[PDB]
Amino acid sequence: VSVLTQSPGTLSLSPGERATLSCRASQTVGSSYLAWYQQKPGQAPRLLIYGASSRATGIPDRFSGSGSGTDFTLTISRLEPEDFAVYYCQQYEAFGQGTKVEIK
Amino acid sequence: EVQLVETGGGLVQPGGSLKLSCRASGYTFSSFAMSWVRQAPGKGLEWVSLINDRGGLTFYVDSVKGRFTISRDNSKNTLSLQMHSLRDGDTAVYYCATGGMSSALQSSKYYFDFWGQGALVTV
Amino acid sequence: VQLVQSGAEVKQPGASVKVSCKASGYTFSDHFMHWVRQAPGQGLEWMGWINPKSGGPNYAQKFQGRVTMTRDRSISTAYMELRGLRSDDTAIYYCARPMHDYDDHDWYFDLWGRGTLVTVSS
Amino acid sequence: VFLGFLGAAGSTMGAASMTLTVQARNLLSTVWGIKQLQARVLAVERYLRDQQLLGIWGCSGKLICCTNVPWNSSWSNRNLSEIWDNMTWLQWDKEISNYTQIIYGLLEESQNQQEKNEQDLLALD
Amino acid sequence: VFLGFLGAAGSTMGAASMTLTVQARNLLSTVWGIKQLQARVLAVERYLRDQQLLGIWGCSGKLICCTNVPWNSSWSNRNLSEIWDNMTWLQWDKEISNYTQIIYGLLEESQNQQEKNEQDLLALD
Amino acid sequence: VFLGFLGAAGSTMGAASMTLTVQARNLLSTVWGIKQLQARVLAVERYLRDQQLLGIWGCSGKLICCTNVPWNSSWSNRNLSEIWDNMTWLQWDKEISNYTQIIYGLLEESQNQQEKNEQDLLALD
Amino acid sequence: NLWVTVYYGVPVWKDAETTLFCASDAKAYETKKHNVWATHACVPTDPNPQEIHLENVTEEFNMWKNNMVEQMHTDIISLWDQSLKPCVKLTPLCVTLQCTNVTNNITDDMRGELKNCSFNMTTELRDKRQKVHALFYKLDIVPINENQNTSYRLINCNTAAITQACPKVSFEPIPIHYCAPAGFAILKCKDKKFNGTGPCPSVSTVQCTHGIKPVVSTQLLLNGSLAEEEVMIRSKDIRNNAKNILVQFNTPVQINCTRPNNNTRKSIRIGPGQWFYATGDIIGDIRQAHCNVSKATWNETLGKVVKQLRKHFGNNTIIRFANSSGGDLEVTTHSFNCGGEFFYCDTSGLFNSTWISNDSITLPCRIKQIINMWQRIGQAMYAPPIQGVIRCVSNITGLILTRDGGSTDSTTETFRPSGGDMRDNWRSELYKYKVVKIEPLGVAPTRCKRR
Ligand SMILES: *[C@@H]1O[C@H](CO)[C@@H](O[C@@H]2O[C@H](CO)[C@@H](O[C@@H]3O[C@H](CO)[C@@H](O)[C@H](O[C@H]4O[C@H](CO)[C@@H](O)[C@H](O)[C@@H]4O)[C@@H]3O)[C@H](O)[C@H]2NC(C)=O)[C@H](O)[C@H]1NC(C)=O
Ligand SMILES: *[C@@H]1O[C@H](CO)[C@@H](O[C@@H]2O[C@H](CO)[C@@H](O)[C@H](O)[C@H]2NC(C)=O)[C@H](O)[C@H]1NC(C)=O
Ligand SMILES: *[C@@H]1O[C@H](CO)[C@@H](O[C@@H]2O[C@H](CO)[C@@H](O)[C@H](O)[C@H]2NC(C)=O)[C@H](O)[C@H]1NC(C)=O
Ligand SMILES: *[C@@H]1O[C@H](CO)[C@@H](O[C@@H]2O[C@H](CO)[C@@H](O)[C@H](O)[C@H]2NC(C)=O)[C@H](O)[C@H]1NC(C)=O
Ligand SMILES: *[C@@H]1O[C@H](CO)[C@@H](O[C@@H]2O[C@H](CO)[C@@H](O)[C@H](O)[C@H]2NC(C)=O)[C@H](O)[C@H]1NC(C)=O
Ligand SMILES: *[C@@H]1O[C@H](CO)[C@@H](O)[C@H](O)[C@H]1NC(C)=O
Ligand SMILES: *[C@@H]1O[C@H](CO)[C@@H](O)[C@H](O)[C@H]1NC(C)=O
Ligand SMILES: *[C@@H]1O[C@H](CO)[C@@H](O)[C@H](O)[C@H]1NC(C)=O
Ligand SMILES: *[C@@H]1O[C@H](CO)[C@@H](O)[C@H](O)[C@H]1NC(C)=O
Ligand SMILES: *[C@@H]1O[C@H](CO)[C@@H](O)[C@H](O)[C@H]1NC(C)=O
Ligand SMILES: *[C@@H]1O[C@H](CO)[C@@H](O)[C@H](O)[C@H]1NC(C)=O
Ligand SMILES: *[C@@H]1O[C@H](CO)[C@@H](O)[C@H](O)[C@H]1NC(C)=O
Ligand SMILES: *[C@@H]1O[C@H](CO)[C@@H](O)[C@H](O)[C@H]1NC(C)=O
Ligand SMILES: *[C@@H]1O[C@H](CO)[C@@H](O)[C@H](O)[C@H]1NC(C)=O
Ligand SMILES: *[C@@H]1O[C@H](CO)[C@@H](O)[C@H](O)[C@H]1NC(C)=O
Ligand SMILES: *[C@@H]1O[C@H](CO)[C@@H](O)[C@H](O)[C@H]1NC(C)=O
Ligand SMILES: *[C@@H]1O[C@H](CO)[C@@H](O)[C@H](O)[C@H]1NC(C)=O
Ligand SMILES: *[C@@H]1O[C@H](CO)[C@@H](O)[C@H](O)[C@H]1NC(C)=O
Ligand SMILES: *[C@@H]1O[C@H](CO)[C@@H](O)[C@H](O)[C@H]1NC(C)=O
């Protein structure tokens, strides 16, 4: 499968500023196949980004992403209160470890 | 590289029939129009005839329209000029030349870029 | 568009669990059905998919031999049966439908299931 | 419209060459409905093919059209009176049926594209 | 394509004779599928009939076409300003509806076949 | 008929402008029967639309047709040798695809109706 | 300086989707009274078809987005449906069946496959009834109740009604050629190493495609085309495991299939003009159906496939072949139909190999008469039994595979046979074909001016 490393393990910010979550694929060939999932505690994951850059239907524009090859990133423009969860990157059947965005 | 060699000059009697010819080497003969231009021994140049690249558009100077006939063979790389009923004003050195017109698919070529050695016709 | 799973259940080591996933709203045969594992305090973990139209399942190597996924097309329901249960199999088991994108990269799980906790204890 | 249709089929070729509009106007118009629709569509396609053949010969909108193609005596060595004052178009078609495609290929590609290229190159002058 | 369609139907005949392409471009496009196919095939046949009428008058590829047919004052004795600057084509068609076939038969067979035979015989010279 | 079809699609534009008849001749030809009838009727309608476009430009019965529309260097600033001796029609169509309608509207209504009105008014003299 | 010149008949095209019409041999139509895949909806083919080489033309092809495959799917399903509308519908046969074991001459493998079943049946007169017996296969009958009453029902009867194929209609795939209407062209990729996607530098235009036999099969492509130079591996995304991998052999593997039982056909009248054909009695010994493949030929082709897979998955990766994880009988077994009888072969012998980076096989096959074709629930058909012993020869020209996911270790790649959708069976023949629209109107600059 494709190994996905989603650094950093825990990222401590405060509301309203821009966070740049990153995922790095290792055992791949390099393409635009990635998805970003948001999983709030006690809830199932939810799709945000479907593709290297495109956005899932219904998701606000504050959630945006980009990348190509073997380096991709999620950019939350505005850390509104309903934007703190665990974020995962998916390359086919493989999933990232998970990035915690916690208030600080 | 470009060389045009005229042949068939000779001494004709008024009212005779001659067949001038021009050979070419050094370029694609089928992609250029060809012209015949005459210089009388004591006067300047005068344009006689024009034929297109394909060989189906033929133009003549007012004097020689019904008498002279231009033709070209794009497989033999030869240009020919049949001159019937040669009068006394037709004595001159004739040059086969490259140019005069062009196809719609090429740029304008309203000039003669390559000329030949020359062939004197006395009549 | 909704996937209702079965209720949470508790089992002993060595037994077999069979989670289910009823589907409503969309044509059940058009999309594949994937089963995903979220262990407590761990990342997401894909287990397998099943083609509803054929029934042909793909499993992950760790679950080869122990998991059997099936479907009943009449009631638009999918099933996943994890036999030979062990301690680490305690996890939430979601049923996910990839969406119909333009490149036919059917791995974008827009539609997840709410989950079904399987607690293995002695 | 139908009046006079084919009425010069036993007349001489010249006498029959004066009624061409009568035969040109008569060339255009459940499971039975699709069979009749297929017949009508084939009539339309056939008329279009004939008009395309006329148009690739420089003969559009023309019932009589002269060309720059010499007649070959191999095709027919008959004299003009024999053909136009002593024969019908049916007999003519019987005689030339095995030469039609040669004429149609001497009209299709040689004469028309040559002439058309020469008009383009004369329009350049 | 549809923009401007029939927009000069209340304009004078001359003003409406400057938009002919707008109306010429708008003349060409289960059991329901065969009904719509029959409608489309009839539209095609109708366009072909109109173009055939134009072609048998020496008017192919022409939206305005002059002829050698004199106007008869019996058909209409109105002056040019009345027709072209003070009437619409609908009123005109209402006026000439009972004379159309006479004009169409004076264009069909007299003028065009006469002219066409004369061009053939002049091409002989 | 099919022989040589599209065979100059990798040739230069000029070399490919000498085989136009080969591609012009290849443009005309139960529930399955109505599907195939719909395909045939759409082919007929498509040919008729193309011929109507040619006819509203003064280009009827013509495979090559010159016009009075100047070329704009904004459409393409390439030299004649580049286009006709160093490009194929496919690449050309890729280049001009976003300018085709401007040219088609400069041919549709300006050039042809202007020219046609002027021929009518010269025929008056 | 330069002026607009209009050109009609320019060799310009664009990608397009149209309704293609077949072409078939009139000859075979005279030999074939009827074939499910109608030669009547289609047209007689033209002898000496034309293929013009488009020299200097490089065209973009996409095997995985081709509407010819979808039209073929629609056409084959619809031809089947109309070939099965006139035939008799076996609704009167949905009755309780009292079934007992057949043990006249039975080998240990064939134990219980066939059952002797008695039932009450309608006759031509509406006021009288008859009791009739027929042999049925275990896969076509389901227990009515858990208790051992030995009462049985046909599997379809709960959810749907089962049509009977007409005995005269034949099932042999005959080649069909797909042709383009006027104003459309079929471009054929002549590159011998093409994987069905990307630019194709060697292109030709064809009036019609080559004859494609509608062969319905799973896990193995039969009687198809063969690769010219090397084994061809074609997947929409090879890294993705949800997309089936299509394999093309350069050399076929001959497969010999047989049902050695001498079968008989018993006519049973169920209506005024409606008949039901039944298995009758099997003359002689009863033995299981099976298929033979050459073991050396299979191993050499598998090695070639392994080499091509290594070209996509690493030079030192271990290529393991294993058998189907599960699913319906169609996908789990090599399903096919030859002679009118529908086989289902266990290909566990075929895919039983681990390939490290450095005599015949017999497949036990099973027979069925209730067939659900094309992954549809509710439109089953009853296949009438075929009288006599059937022997059957075919070429294995390719495979349909699925690569296992979730690999914990990265040194191995496991590939299991798959299938079920015939759009991936008919896309292995149409991979090199794309329909295009001719755009014959062109405008280009010239120095020529209208007078
Ligand atoms: C792959 O191709 C091979 C070779 O083409 C093909 O095997 C052939 O199948 C046909 C049709 O099943 C076989 O022909 C049958 O066998 C004999 C030989 O003549 C006859 O008994 C049969 O005719 C009976 O059935 C007909 C109805 O189908 C009736 O009309 C007729 O009256 C008879 O009752 C029939 O022709 C042929 O023998 C084989 N050939 C070989 C070499 O095996 C195979 O089926 C193809 N495979 C697949 C999976 O499609
Ligand atoms: C299936 O069982 C039936 C009984 O319904 C058998 O048919 C009978 O066979 C005997 C011979 O043993 C005949 O004498 C009887 O006349 C048959 N029954 C009837 C109603 O005619 C049949 O042999 C069995 N078939 C198999 C294959 O075992
Ligand atoms: C089929 O061959 C083509 C051409 O070699 C491959 O396309 C290359 O791979 C990817 C797409 O997978 C793209 O970057 C380019 O289109 C190609 N890259 C090049 C030429 O550098 C295609 O991947 C091959 N497919 C298979 C299944 O082997
Ligand atoms: C498939 O292979 C088997 C095993 O080799 C064949 O079975 C043999 O068939 C021959 C010829 O009829 C018999 O004499 C042998 O006794 C059989 N051997 C066994 C059962 O071990 C079978 O014929 C083959 N089937 C085909 C080619 O259809
Ligand atoms: C698949 O392969 C396995 C071995 O990988 C086969 O099982 C062995 O078969 C041999 C020869 O018959 C026996 O001596 C061994 O005892 C078997 N077991 C093992 C663990 O090797 C198996 O028969 C094959 N399956 C088929 C052909 O369906
Ligand atoms: C038939 O032939 C006769 C004499 O052969 C001639 O007078 C007459 O006009 C012809 N009629 C037609 C209709 O061709
Ligand atoms: C007439 O046809 C013959 C063959 O029958 C051919 O040899 C000859 O060249 C043709 N004549 C002309 C002038 O084309
Ligand atoms: C034309 O047709 C036949 C058929 O090919 C040919 O053999 C014959 O010579 C020709 N007939 C006439 C009357 O010229
Ligand atoms: C309508 O008529 C008025 C005056 O009668 C005129 O000014 C106007 O242009 C006409 N409009 C049209 C669309 O014909
Ligand atoms: C005009 O029509 C009348 C009949 O109304 C007819 O007598 C007359 O000859 C026609 N005039 C011309 C010039 O044709
Ligand atoms: C034209 O139509 C009618 C119907 O034949 C005719 O009687 C009438 O005289 C004409 N009408 C006009 C307004 O010229
Ligand atoms: C292909 O190109 C070569 C050189 O580029 C040329 O010689 C040849 O004529 C071309 N062929 C076609 C069919 O366009
Ligand atoms: C050429 O196109 C430009 C716009 O790109 C326009 O401004 C200009 O007038 C055009 N030239 C002519 C001669 O029509
Ligand atoms: C023509 O097509 C695209 C699509 O609009 C346009 O953006 C581009 O500038 C043009 N392409 C070329 C190669 O001229
Ligand atoms: C057939 O009908 C008889 C009575 O006619 C009944 O006793 C028997 O059970 C029926 N057999 C079945 C349903 O197999
Ligand atoms: C099987 O393959 C051989 C060898 O290529 C070939 O000659 C034969 O026609 C093929 N048979 C079938 C039924 O496709
Ligand atoms: C099958 O049975 C029929 C019935 O007569 C017989 O003719 C034929 O020889 C038998 N075939 C075999 C292979 O036993
Ligand atoms: C696959 O092979 C295994 C043994 O490895 C066997 O038990 C199983 O039944 C096979 N599955 C199918 C679907 O044939
Ligand atoms: C096939 O060759 C491979 C080589 O790795 C190996 O599995 C085995 O020796 C061969 N198997 C058979 C059954 O011939």
Numbering used by the authors:
A (entry chain L): 1 to 27, 27A, 28 to 91, 96 to 107
B (entry chain G): 1 to 52, 52A, 53 to 82, 82A, 82B, 82C, 83 to 100, 100A, ...
C (entry chain H): 2 to 52, 52A, 53 to 82, 82A, 82B, 82C, 83 to 100, 100A, ...
D (entry chain F), E (entry chain D), F (entry chain B): 518 to 546, 569 to 664
G (entry chain A): 33 to 141, 150 to 185, 185A, 185B, 185C, 188 to 309, 312 to 321, 321A, ...
Quote the paper.
In a double-blinded, placebo-controlled phase 1 human clinical trial, the recombinant, germline-targeting envelope glycoprotein (Env) trimer BG505 SOSIP.v4.1-GT1.1, adjuvanted with AS01B, induced bnAb precursors of the VRC01-class at a high frequency in the majority of vaccine recipients. These bnAb precursors, that target the CD4 receptor binding site, had undergone somatic hypermutation characteristic of the VRC01-class. The GT strategy for inducing VRC01-class bnAb precursors is rooted in the hypothesis that these antibodies target the CD4bs with a similar angle of approach to VRC01 and use the same conserved contact residues. To verify that VRC01-class mAbs elicited by GT1.1 do not just exhibit similar sequence features to VRC01-class bnAbs but also target the CD4bs in a similar manner and with the same atomic contacts, we selected five mAbs for further structural characterization.
Accordingly, based on the prototypic BG505 SOSIP trimer, we designed GT1.1 to engage bnAb precursors against the trimer apex and the CD4bs, specifically those of the VRC01-class. Finally, GT1.1-induced VRC01-class mAbs are structurally extremely similar to VRC01-class bnAbs. An important hallmark of VRC01-class bnAbs is their ability to accommodate the N276 glycan, which is achieved through specific SHM events as germline variants of VRC01-class bnAbs do not bind to Env with the N276 glycan. When inspecting the GT1.1-bound structures of the three mAbs that did not have measurable affinity for fully glycosylated BG505 SOSIP, we found that these mAbs would clash with the N276 glycan. We conclude that GT1.1 vaccination selects for CDRL1 characteristics that help accommodate the N276 glycan, without the need for the N276 glycan to be present in the vaccine.
